[PDB]
From a paper:
To provide a structural basis for recognition of TIR-DNA by SETMAR, we used a selenomethionine (SeMet) phasing strategy to determine the crystal structure of the SETMAR DBD comprising residues 329 to 440 complexed to a 25-mer DNA derived from the Hsmar1 TIR at 2.37 Å resolution. Thus as previously reported, a phasing strategy was devised in which strategic Met substitutions (I359M) (L423M) within two predicated alpha helical elements were introduced; these Met substitutions were critical for phasing. The C381R substitution was introduced to prevent disulfide bond formation. The structure of the complex is dimeric with two DBDs, each bound to a TIR-DNA duplex oriented in parallel to one another; the DBD comprises two helix–turn–helix (HTH) motifs connected by a 17 amino acid residue linker (residues 384–400) containing two AT hook elements bound to the 25-mer TIR DNA duplex. A relatively large surface area (1610 Å2) involving interactions of F344, F363, and I341 in each HTH1 motif is buried in the dimer interface. Sequence-specific recognition of the 19 bp TIR element (5′-GGTGCAAAAGTAATTGCGG) is mediated by 32 hydrogen-bonding interactions, nine in the major groove (two in HTH1 and seven in HTH2), five in the minor groove from the AT-hook elements within the linker, and 18 with the phosphodiester backbone. Within HTH1, the larger of the two HTH motifs, a single residue, R371 in recognition helix α3, forms two nucleobase-specific hydrogen bonds with G5 (B chain). From HTH2, S428 and R432 of recognition helix α6 hydrogen bond to C18 and G17 (B chain) and G8 and C9 (C chain); R417 and H427 hydrogen bond to G5 and G6 (C chain), respectively. Within the central AT-rich regions of the TIR, R392 and R395 act as two AT hooks forming specific hydrogen bonds to nucleobases in the minor groove. Individual substitution of Ala for R371, S428, or R432 located in the recognition helices in FL SETMAR resulted in significant decreases in affinity with relative KD values for binding of WT, R371A, S428A, and R432A to TIR DNA of 42 ± 5, 521 ± 65, 485 ± 58, and 302 ± 47 nM, respectively.
Author numbering:
A (entry chain A), B (entry chain A): 330 to 437
Amino acid sequence: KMMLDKKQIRAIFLFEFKMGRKAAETTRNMNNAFGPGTANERTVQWWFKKFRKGDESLEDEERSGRPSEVDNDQLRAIIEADPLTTTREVAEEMNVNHSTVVRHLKQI
Amino acid sequence: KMMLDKKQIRAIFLFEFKMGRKAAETTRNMNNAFGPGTANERTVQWWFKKFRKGDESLEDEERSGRPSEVDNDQLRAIIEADPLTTTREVAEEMNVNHSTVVRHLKQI
DNA sequence: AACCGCAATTACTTTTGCACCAACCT
DNA sequence: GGTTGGTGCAAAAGTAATTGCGGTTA
DNA sequence: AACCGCAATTACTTTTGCACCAACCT
DNA sequence: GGTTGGTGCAAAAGTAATTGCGGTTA
């Protein structure tokens, strides 16, 4: 039955926060309306706390991801010193796979 | 202030319908919480009526779009009778632009 | 007070024409 | 140079959503 | 009864290695 | 044949969301 995205769930939290409900009250309303396990009290309090500060964005904060192992300036210098060089030759010197070279050359 | 998608708005309608609210009641709750012009009574009744039948999908029904002016079987036959023929030659015979021929040849 | 039929208006859908293009051909 | 398949994007051609007014049921 | 700090767990993010490939080269 | 740039996708390496338990304020 329950087909809602995280964004749709969070919009209902925001609606409920703006109606003046307490988070524990909103939790009960959501489990009654959509069924058990729709909302957790602690999660609703975590969101209400963000809303109460004026942060009404329903998105996650940005995640930087895996740190890059390639220095684009070094790659630029290796290419400028030898423009003939293949991706497999650059990869051996840079201790990466040639596909990482291919992908980073598209960036620069 | 108001940043919600149609899908987020519709999820709030569904929540409210499942809480046992009347559509005119939900309309007032949404305009009070998010501000004037957030919801219209007639629209909320149109959605509640779909929900009441058991249709709890928050998507629009599919739209077929512009009707196609090209017969793919004819295009297949023109190509099979003369494989040498260019998109501009096929377009002249089919009363379309060559780009429609290009696009429809990708389909088949 | 609430909902709904109806119809006018708005927003979406997919497809097409024209302008313009780069790679390949002549 | 010319030819060719291909794409960006506005206009086109459709269906379904949006919603104000008046009727009907409460 | 409700919220929150804290920490364990889960879900997401972007990047990389390896397997495998088709077009072009030798 | 071999070489080459390129992609699919699983594994990797990160940050932030999710949430149960115990403390604190009511």
